[PDB]
Amino acid sequence: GLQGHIACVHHIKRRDIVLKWELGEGAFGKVFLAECHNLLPEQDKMLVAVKALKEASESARQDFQREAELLTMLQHQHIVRFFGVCTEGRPLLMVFEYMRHGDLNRFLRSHGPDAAGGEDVAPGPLGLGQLLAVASQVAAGMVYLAGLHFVHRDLATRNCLVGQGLVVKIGDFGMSRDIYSTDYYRVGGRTMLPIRWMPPESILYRKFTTESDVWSFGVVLWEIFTYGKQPWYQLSNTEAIDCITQGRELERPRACPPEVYAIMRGCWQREPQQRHSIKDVHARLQALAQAPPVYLDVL
Numbered sequence: 001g002l003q004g005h006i007a008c009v010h011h012i013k014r015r016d017i018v019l020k021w022e023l024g025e026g027a028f029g030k031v032f033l034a035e036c037h038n039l040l041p042e043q044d045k046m047l048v049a050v051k052a053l054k055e056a057s058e059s060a061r062q063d064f065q066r067e068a069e070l071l072t073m074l075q076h077q078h079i080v081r082f083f084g085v086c087t088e089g090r091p092l093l094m095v096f097e098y099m100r101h102g103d104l105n106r107f108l109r110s111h112g113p114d115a116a117g118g119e120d121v122a123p124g125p126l127g128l129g130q131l132l133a134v135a136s137q138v139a140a141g142m143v144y145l146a147g148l149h150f151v152h153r154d155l156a157t158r159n160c161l162v163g164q165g166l167v168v169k170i171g172d173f174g175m176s177r178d179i180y181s182t183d184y185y186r187v188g189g190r191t192m193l194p195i196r197w198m199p200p201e202s203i204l205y206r207k208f209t210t211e212s213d214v215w216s217f218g219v220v221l222w223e224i225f226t227y228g229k230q231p232w233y234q235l236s237n238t239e240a241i242d243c244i245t246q247g248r249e250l251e252r253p254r255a256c257p258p259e260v261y262a263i264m265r266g267c268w269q270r271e272p273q274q275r276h277s278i279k280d281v282h283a284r285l286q287a288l289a290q291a292p293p294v295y296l297d298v299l
C-alpha cells in the first residue's frame with residue numbers, strides 16, 4: 001500500500017493508549033478504537049483508531065517501519081492523520097485519527113436514494129452540493145499525492161474515510177481486499193487487482209502512473225454519484241476487463257449532472273497523456289462544490 005509507491009516517525013508510549021474495542025479485522029491485522037492520552041495539547045483524552053500488526057516477523061517488522069516512515073511523510077488536510085507508532089513490546093501499533101462514519105463507500109450506501117439523517121448529514125439521499133463536496137475533498141488529497149509523485153494504485157471510495165462534519169480523507173487500514181473481496185480480481189494464489197477502477201494500460205500493460213490514478217478518480221466520482229454502487233456491477237471480472245480494454249465507458253449516473261459527467265469523461269481518455277490533471281479536476285469540482293444554490297439548482 002505504501003512501499004513501491006512513489007527516525008522521522010513519532011512514538012507513543014503503550015500506557016498512553018487504552019484499547020476499547022475492535023472496529024475491523026483482516027489477514028495482516030486488526031483495528032481498535034482506543035483512547036489516547038497526552039497526544040494533542042488541547043485534547044487531554046481523545047479517540048483514535050489503532051492498527052495492530054498481526055505477525056511481528058523480521059519482514060513484517062521492516063514493512064511496518066517503512067509504512068510508518070511513508071505515513072509520516074504523507075500528511076495533509078485530506079489524508080487520514082497518522083499520529084505515530086507504539087513499538088515498545090508486541091503487538092506493534094500504528095495510531096490514527098478516528099473517522100466516525102467509516103469508509104466512504106459504506107457512507108454513500110447508507111445515504112442513498114432509498115434513505116436516516118443525523119448530526120452531520122440531512123435526511124434522505126445526499127444532495128448535489130454534498131456529493132460535490134465529497135468528490136472535491138477526495139480530489140484535493142489526490143492533488144497532494146500527485147504533487148509528491150505518489151501513485152496510490154487502489155483509489156476507490158472503500159479506501160477513503162469519512163469523519164465528523166463529513167470531512168472526507170484518503171486512507172485505509174490495509175484490509176480492503178478482506179472486507180471488499182468482490183472489488184478485486186484474484187489472479188495469483190495471493191494477488192488481487194482492483195480491475196474495475198483500473199485503466200486499460202494498467203490492465204493490459206501493468207503500468208501504474210499519476211494518470212492511472214486520475215482514471216481511478218474518474219471511477220471514484222462515478223461511485224460518489226451512484227451512492228457507492230460497484231462500477232460494472234452487472235459484469236463479471238473477465239467481462240469487466242473486456243469492457244475496459246475495448247474502451248466502453250461507464251454510463252452517466254441518474255444523479256450526475258452532464259457537467260460532472262464531463263469531468264468523469266476527462267479522466268477516462270484512453271491515452272494517459274490526454275487525461276486532465278488532478279489539479280484541473282479538483283478546480284472544477286471545488287468550483288461546483290462552492291457554487292451558489294442558484295447556480296447548482298439549474299446544473
Ligand SMILES: COCc1ccc(OC(F)(F)F)c(CNC(=O)Nc2c(-c3ccccc3)nc3c(C)nccn23)c1
Nearest residue numbers: 001002051067074079080094096152170171172173174
Ligand atoms: C487509515 O489510513 C491511513 C493511510 C493514510 C495514507 C495512505 O496513503 C495514501 F492513501 F496514499 F495517502 C494510506 C495508504 N494505504 C495503505 O498503505 N494501505 C495498506 C496497508 C496499511 C495501512 C495502514 C497501516 C499499515 C498498513 N497495508 C496494506 C496492504 C498489506 N495491502 C494493500 C494496502 N495496504 C493509508
